[PDB]
Amino acid sequence: HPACITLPERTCRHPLTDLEANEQLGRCEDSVKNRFDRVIPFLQVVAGIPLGLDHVTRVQELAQSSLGHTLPEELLKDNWISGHNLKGIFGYATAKALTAATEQFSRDDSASAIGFFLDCGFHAVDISPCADGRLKGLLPYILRLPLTAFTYRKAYAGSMFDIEDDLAQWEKNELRRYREGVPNTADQPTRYLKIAVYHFSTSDPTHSGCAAHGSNDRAALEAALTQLMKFREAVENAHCCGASIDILLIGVDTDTDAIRVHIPDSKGFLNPYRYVDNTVTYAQTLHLAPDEARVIIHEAILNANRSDGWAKGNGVASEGMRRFIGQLLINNLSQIDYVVNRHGGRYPPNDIGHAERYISVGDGFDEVQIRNLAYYAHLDTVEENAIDVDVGITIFTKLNLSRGLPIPIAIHYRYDPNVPGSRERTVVKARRIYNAIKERFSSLDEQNLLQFRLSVQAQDIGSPIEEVASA
């Protein structure tokens, strides 16, 4: 094991691990995944019920006791040709599992978390990981970054984030600084921070890596880094008077959830060979007092910046950037422990690759950001992001269709309840996505192999999720 040397015969507990958070995060992961996974054994039972004799009450009762809810009668009308509506019941029960999980974990830290970004020199934190379900837990698990109005997470196949869209967000955010002074006034020396996250598997590099880059780790890193550079060039060249941003590249080993963070130089440039590997930091501080362990991490970040040769930079990163990076590394130590303590090593064989329960498209769920729960593609149209959609369907062809299960798809968007007509335009959008995915995969749709749930939610964190009909 690359972080916990003594495994399997002795388990590591890191002195910087937040134990209560790891408990809460574990309860959340098991409970949520259970809600989805228990649908499958339930369907097997339904499938064995004899056709031809009434079994409505029998099915409704089993649903109540197995899933904790009833089913609508019209899904319990067998069709004379194909029998039980297993596809329809799967889609319904899966939508209910999502409702229950988001209601249960719906959510002070708010202002303290933005205060921390501000102090590090950032007025926004915009993060783009790969769409792969094993980065779905990126914010609450891998990085332990609290949800705030200025923390974005927009996932794309291969981390290939939308440059024009990100430019538009930069513009909106900067205008708000000028007009309202939120989260700070425009005279303050802060920058918009864009983070890209690439991933790899250390136990199965050539098969379990980023498939968008052919499981070539070098190509995945370089694509993510090139996208960051291209976004910086857009902001700098599209706007006069020294417009700029900060960039950060993070790599994730999906086997252990450990990060490696690429350290910028004093000019904000990144290098593929200049980084702190948290697996080595974990091992180097495992036997230290908490305060000493923090000093080592602070020193490891600085040491990365004194590098010459291949890793040579123009000086050290700003103090705020180095503080920010130290906190990510510190948080991530808890996550390395999380996996170690739950699995006695790396994630088990059934959780090393893709094991997503649904595809999420749109703005994503704040409430259920859990590893391998969902493949998440941020998009406003299928037309502009067709590849991200095609990659999720490919993944779900192996996961679900290979075993006769439909692909469940959650379409979800945020709106502004203070803006007249915002809710309606968002609903119209949600319904365009639905029709556009149906038209793109029309034979899958004809077989009832695509099961959709549309929803909308006010932009404030903690707002109720509002389900909307497909028409």
Helices and strands: H and E segment counts in the chain: 13, 11
Nearer to Zn ion, 52 or 189 (CB): 52
Evaluate whether 231 touches 284 at the Cβ level (below 8 Å): no
Measured CA to CA, the distance from residue 266 to residue 260 in angstroms comes to 19
Contact between 436 and a copy of itself per CB under 8 A: yes
3-state secondary structure at position 253:
strand
Position 59: which residue type? V
CB of 310 vs a copy of itself, minimal distance in Å: 25
Annotation marks residue 18 as catalytic: no
- Burial of 168: CB neighbours in 10 Å, binned 0-12, 13-18, 19+: exposed
CA atoms within 13 A on the CB side of 468: 26
Taking the least distance from each CB to a copy of itself, the nearer of 243 and 302 is 243
Q: To the nearest whole angstrom, how small is the minimum distance from the Cβ of residue 192 to a copy of itself? A: 13
For a copy of itself, the closer of residues 290 and 421 by Cβ is 421
144 three-class SS: coil
Instruction: Find, among 173, 141, 125, 135, the residue nearest to 155 by Cα.
Output: 135
Q: Is 174 in the site for a copy of itself (CB under 8 A)?
A: yes
According to the binding rule CB under 8 A, does residue 237 interact with a copy of itself?
yes
* Residue 425 in the binding site for a copy of itself (CB under 8 A): yes
- Check binding of 132 to Zn ion (CB under 5 A): yes
Q: Applying CB under 8 A, which of residues 239, 298, 423, 438 lies at the interface with a copy of itself? A: 239
Question: Which of these segments, 25-33, 277-285, 362-370, 419-427, binds a copy of itself (CB under 8 A)?
Answer: 419-427
Instruction: Find the Cα–Cα–Cα–Cα dihedral 375, 376, 380, 386, rounded to 10°.
Output: -40
| By the rule CB under 8 A, 469 interacts with a copy of itself | no
Closer Cβ to Zn ion, 132 or 253, answer by number:
132
Q: Is 411 helix (H, G, I), strand (E, B) or coil?
A: strand
**Peptide-bond breaks in the chain following residues (C–N over 2.5 A):** 107
* Annotated active-site residue in 132, 255, 257, 363: 132
The entry of a copy of itself, Zn ion, none near residue 382 (CB within 5 to 8 angstroms by kind) is a copy of itself
| Burial degree of 387 (CB within 10 A; 0-12, 13-18, 19+) | middle
Q: Check binding of 458 to a copy of itself (CB under 8 A).
A: no
* 202: number of Cβ within 10 Å: 17
Of 31 and 184, nearer to a copy of itself (C-beta) is 184
Q: Which is nearer to a copy of itself, 179 or 403 (CB)?
A: 179
Binding characters for Zn ion, 336-375, by CB under 5 A (x = yes): ----------------------------------------
Residues contributing to the site for a copy of itself (CB under 8 A): 163-164, 168, 171-172, 174-175, 178-180, 186, 230, 233-234, 237-241, 243, 381-384, 416, 418-422, 425, 432, 436
**Residues recognised as catalytic:** 132
